[PDB]
Symmetry: D2
Subunit: 113 residues, 4 copies
């Protein structure tokens, strides 16, 4: 699991469950092509998005559908989504973590091994 996503809910102090996540890779023509996607689990994690062979150096975007999550809870949100854009470079494992509030979010990368 070279790439993992973890989402937390700052309002309820819990994992953010069933949040849609989309991963894109930047293409030569500079547009974003879909690469992988999923929903966070009960623990607010999304595993299995990709593999070591597949996850080559490049620029990647992770898009988290924050707005649907807040809508689900009946709380007005500010952001359309939360977007994280990064260069992967060459034995690393990437965890993209996000902490969510209706009017704020924080994202962090934990890069290890």
């Amino acid at each position: 699991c070279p790439l993992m996503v973890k989402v937390l809910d700052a309002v309820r102090g819990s994992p953010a469950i069933n949040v849609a996540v989309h991963v894109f890779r930047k293409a030569a023509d500079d547009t974003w092509e879909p690469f992988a996607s999923g929903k966070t689990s009960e623990s607010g994690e999304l595993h299995g998005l990709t593999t070591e062979e597949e996850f080559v150096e490049g620029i990647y975007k992770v898009e988290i559908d924050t707005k649907s999550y807040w809508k689900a809870l009946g709380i007005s949100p500010f952001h359309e989504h939360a977007e994280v854009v990064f260069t992967a470079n060459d034995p690393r494992r990437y965890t993209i973590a996000a902490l969510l509030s209706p009017y704020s979010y924080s994202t962090t990368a934990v890069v290890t091994n």
Copy 2:
């Protein structure tokens, strides 16, 4: 002004100065159009991006060039940029302050929305 951007450096505990900011607005055909741009001042603030009549309802994107900032300081950061996407003025005009707090492998963004 109805849109202001404020950037802070969590490493040095200072305003993040001379940070490029680009604003886009989603067009009818679903493309992003250039709306405004500028750089943060000595205070880490960017004022004067737009006006009340220009800043109509829509979906707006604020892209903060975090990578260039960190690189200029000798640091190779994780993120390409910090992007904030939002619907504006849906319920009538408001004043928006977009704040970003920057670290090399993390950032937080917050909106303060007030009623003119």
Copy 3:
């Protein structure tokens, strides 16, 4: 003023108004002494806590009464308060802005330190 406190509400995307703030200074005998206090204004800011001559070197604690704020809004928050502890003016006088960003089960605090 050399010490200012700014509080924001991450839920409502607004300044956190009428938030009690208490400041203490570590005494010679290692006890915390009352230094100053106040409440955040409509802008979420608290000014006028102290003066340049009063605000000498030392270790300072700023306790923000987050619990009362959330409770007044109907929310039972995780934290009792948000506490910020820091050495001040160790290298000569500085201006300190202590910022807090509040959510019911989370908070962030940041210091902006500038040279008068």
Copy 4:
């Protein structure tokens, strides 16, 4: 493991390793008595601080020695430490997470089950 602590480093995008953590419980005389302590592991986690029998309702403080961590890395820090104070109330498990920068930190509680 009713109580767990997780610390991350926002500068290096990594777990915050070997960070000292102290847990206190508020006593009737209103002072803090030491309850438990440890250092974060390689994964930036501290487990085994307490047990279900032991971890009764009360007000607890978790103190993270952020300043020593930054000193270890040669980076000037603002805070003396990061303090998290909370009421535990009654089948919960508590994870206290902290994200560290030299001039800023964020803490979040993930409370589950």
